[PDB]
C-alpha cells in the first residue's frame, strides 16, 4: 500500500511525455493554407482583420499572464495647438 500511495502521489506525471504528439507541426494539416501558393500569406493576412477582441471570451480567459490605466499616456512627438 506504500507503493500504491506513491503511485497516487505520482499518478501519471512522467507518462505525459508521449502525449506530446500535438507538438508536431505539418504544413498540410491546415485546410486552406495550401489551396493557393500564396494562401499562406493570405491566411497570415486574413487574421490581421481579427484581434484579441474577436477572440472568444472563454478563449480570452485562457490568456492568463504567467487593463489600461487613465494616467499612462502613449508618447507623442507633435503634441497639438
Amino acid at each position: 500500500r506504500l507503493l500504491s500511495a506513491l503511485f497516487s502521489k505520482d499518478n501519471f506525471r512522467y507518462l505525459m511525455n508521449e502525449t506530446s504528439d500535438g507538438l508536431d507541426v505539418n504544413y498540410l494539416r491546415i485546410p486552406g493554407i495550401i489551396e493557393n501558393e500564396k494562401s499562406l500569406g493570405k491566411l497570415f493576412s486574413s487574421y490581421k482583420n481579427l484581434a484579441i477582441e474577436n477572440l472568444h471570451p472563454d478563449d480570452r480567459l485562457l490568456l492568463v499572464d504567467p487593463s489600461p490605466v487613465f494616467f499612462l499616456r502613449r508618447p507623442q512627438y507633435v503634441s497639438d495647438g
Binding site: E18, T19, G22, L28, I34, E35, L43, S46, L50, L55
Partner: protein
C-alpha cells in the same frame, strides 16, 4: 453568450475563408479550352485516373497540390506521393520555373514526414527521403521560407535543436507573423523543457490563429500542468475539443488523466472518491470504444485491474504494450513496474528487483520503480545494499519530494542508530511534506523521532509522543502511555504521570 465552437471562428473570419478553404470539390480546367471538370472528394477519387486526367489537361500545379493535400487528409500518403511524382512528370511543372518543382519537392518532404509520423517507424529511411527532397527544393528555389521551416523541422527530428533555433531566428528576422515558426520554436522550447518560454509562444500563436493545426491549446494545457493550473488546462482542452472534435483523442486522454488526478488528490470522502473514479473509468471506456489498442490506455487500465487483483490481465496488457511500443522506453518502464508489482504478491523478490531495475533503466524518471527496487532490497534483507542505493538516489535527487523515501531513510538510520541526525532531518522533511500535502502523518515517524530525541531532548520527544497520541486517538497503545508517564515522571509531573500510568 456567444457559442464557443468552430463556427464561432468561422463567422469571425470572412466568408471567403469559411467555405472556399474547406471545399471538397476541385475544379479542373480542361485542355480543350473553357471546359472544366469538377470532382468531389467525398466520392472515392482514384489517384491514377485523376493524375492522368490532370496530366492530359495540364492543369495548374495548385490543383495538383490541393488534390495531394486532400488525399493526405484521406490518409492516402502513397496516393499523395503518386500525385506529386506524376506532377513532376507533368508538362506544366517541366515547363514552369524551378520554384514549382521546389514546392512539390517540399510537399514530398511533408509526405515523408507524415509517413514517419503515422507509423513512428523506419525513421532513418523517411528522414533521408525527406532530406533529399528538401535539399532538391532548396537547390531549385532557396528563397522559399518553407524550405527553412523544413530544415528546422529536420534538425528538430534529429535533435539538432541549435540549428533549428537559428532557422527560426532567421524566420523571425524575416517576419514576426509566421505562425509555423512560432509553433516550431515553442515545440523546441518544450523539448528543451522551457515550458514558460514555449507558453508565451503558444499564447501568441493562439491569439494569431485560433484555428491553427496543430492546436496551441494542447501546449497551453501542458504548460498549465507544469504551472499547476490544471483546471485552466482542462478548460482549454475542452475548448479545443469543441473546436477539434475529430482526430484528437489525445485531448480526451489528457482530460481523463486530469480527472483521475483530481479524484486522487481532491476527493473529500470515500463516496465522492468512488463517484469520481467510476466517472473517470466510464469516460475512459467511452474513449476506448473508439480505440481499443492504444498502449497508454492499456497502461492506465493496468493500474485499475492491478487494484482489482486481476494480475493476469495486467500481465497480458503489459506484454502486449511491450510488443507494440518497445520503441517507447516509458511504456517499457511502466510495464516492468507493473510486472514487478504483480510479482510482489508472488514475492519473487529477485524477479521483482530485476523488473524494477529494468524499469529504471528503460526510463530513469520513474521514481516509483526505484522505490520498489529499494523495497525489494529490503525484502531480500539487503539492509546495507538498500541503504547505499537510497543514499545514492537521495544525493542525486536531494530536491525530489519523495516523502516515503525520506521516511524509509529515517527508519533505516534509526535502526543504525549512529546516523540519528540524518534520521531527524528526513523525518522532519517527511512531516513537512505531509503537512503541505494534507496527508495523514504516520505516528511511527513520531515514535522514531521521540526515540531519537530520548538521548538529545526529552521535551521534543515528549511533544512528538503527544502528537502521535493525538493522531492515534483511541488507537493509543500501552507503550505510548507508559512512555508518556515516564516522561512526565522525569518532568516531575506527578499528576500527569499518574494519569498516564492509570
Amino acid at each position: 453568450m456567444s457559442l464557443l465552437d468552430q463556427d464561432y471562428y468561422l463567422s469571425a473570419l470572412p466568408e471567403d475563408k469559411r467555405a472556399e478553404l474547406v471545399t471538397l470539390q476541385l475544379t479542373i480546367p480542361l485542355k480543350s479550352g473553357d471546359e472544366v471538370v469538377t470532382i468531389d472528394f467525398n466520392e472515392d477519387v482514384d489517384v491514377s485516373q485523376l493524375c492522368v486526367l490532370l496530366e492530359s489537361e495540364n492543369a495548374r500545379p495548385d490543383l495538383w497540390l490541393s488534390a495531394a493535400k486532400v488525399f493526405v487528409s484521406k490518409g492516402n500518403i502513397a496516393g499523395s506521393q503518386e500525385i506529386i511524382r506524376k506532377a513532376l512528370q507533368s508538362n506544366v511543372i517541366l515547363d514552369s520555373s524551378a520554384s514549382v518543382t521546389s514546392l512539390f519537392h517540399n510537399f514530398s518532404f511533408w509526405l515523408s514526414l507524415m509517413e514517419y509520423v503515422s507509423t513512428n517507424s523506419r525513421e532513418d529511411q523517411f528522414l533521408e527521403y525527406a532530406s533529399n527532397s528538401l535539399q532538391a527544393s532548396n537547390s531549385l528555389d532557396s528563397g522559399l521560407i518553407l524550405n527553412g521551416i523544413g530544415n528546422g523541422v529536420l534538425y528538430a527530428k534529429s535533435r539538432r535543436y541549435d540549428e533549428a533555433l537559428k532557422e527560426f531566428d532567421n524566420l523571425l528576422k524575416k517576419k514576426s507573423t509566421n505562425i509555423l515558426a512560432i509553433l516550431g520554436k515553442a515545440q523546441i522550447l518544450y523539448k528543451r523543457q522551457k515550458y514558460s518560454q514555449a507558453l508565451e509562444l503558444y499564447q501568441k500563436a493562439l491569439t494569431i490563429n485560433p484555428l491553427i493545426v496543430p492546436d496551441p491549446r494542447l501546449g497551453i494545457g501542458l504548460c498549465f500542468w507544469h504551472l499547476n493550473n490544471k483546471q485552466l488546462a482542462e478548460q482549454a482542452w475542452h475548448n479545443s475539443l469543441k473546436v477539434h472534435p475529430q482526430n484528437n483523442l489525445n485531448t480526451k486522454i489528457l482530460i481523463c488523466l486530469a480527472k483521475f488526478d483530481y479524484c486522487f488528490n481532491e476527493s473529500k470522502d470515500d463516496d465522492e472518491f468512488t463517484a469520481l473514479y467510476r466517472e473517470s473509468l466510464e469516460f475512459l471506456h467511452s474513449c476506448l470504444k473508439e480505440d481499443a489498442k492504444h498502449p497508454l490506455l492499456l497502461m492506465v487500465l493496468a493500474s485499475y485491474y492491478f487494484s482489482k487483483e486481476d494480475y493476469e490481465k495486467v500481465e497480458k496488457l503489459c506484454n502486449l504494450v511491450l510488443k507494440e511500443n518497445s520503441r517507447n522506453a516509458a511504456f517499457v518502464s511502466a510495464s516492468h513496474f507493473w510486472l514487478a508489482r504483480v510479482a510482489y504478491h508472488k514475492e519473487d523478490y529477485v524477479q521483482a528487483q530485476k523488473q524494477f531495475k529494468q524499469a529504471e533503466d528503460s526510463q530513469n524518471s520513474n521514481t516509483l520503480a526505484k522505490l520498489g527496487y529499494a523495497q525489494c532490497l529490503i525484502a531480500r534483507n539487503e539492509v546495507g545494499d538498500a541503504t547505499i542505493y537510497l543514499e545514492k538516489f537521495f544525493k542525486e535527487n536531494q530536491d525530489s519530494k519523495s516523502s516515503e523515501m525520506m521516511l524509509l531513510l529515517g527508519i533505516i538510520y534509526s535502526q543504525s542508530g549512529k546516523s540519528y541526525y540524518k534520521a531527524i532531518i528526513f523525518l522532519e522533511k517527511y512531516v513537512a511534506v505531509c503537512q503541505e500535502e494534507n496527508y495523514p502523518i504516520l505516528p511511527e515517524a513520531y515514535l522514531v523521532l521521540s526515540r531519537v530525541y530520548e538521548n538529545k531532548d526529552l521535551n521534543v520527544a515528549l511533544d512528538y509522543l503527544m502528537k502521535a497520541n493525538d493522531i492515534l486517538g483511541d488507537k493509543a497503545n500501552v507503550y505510548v502511555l507508559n512512555n508518556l508517564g515516564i516522561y512526565h515522571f522525569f518532568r516531575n509531573n506527578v499528576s500527569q504521570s499518574s494519569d498516564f500510568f492509570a
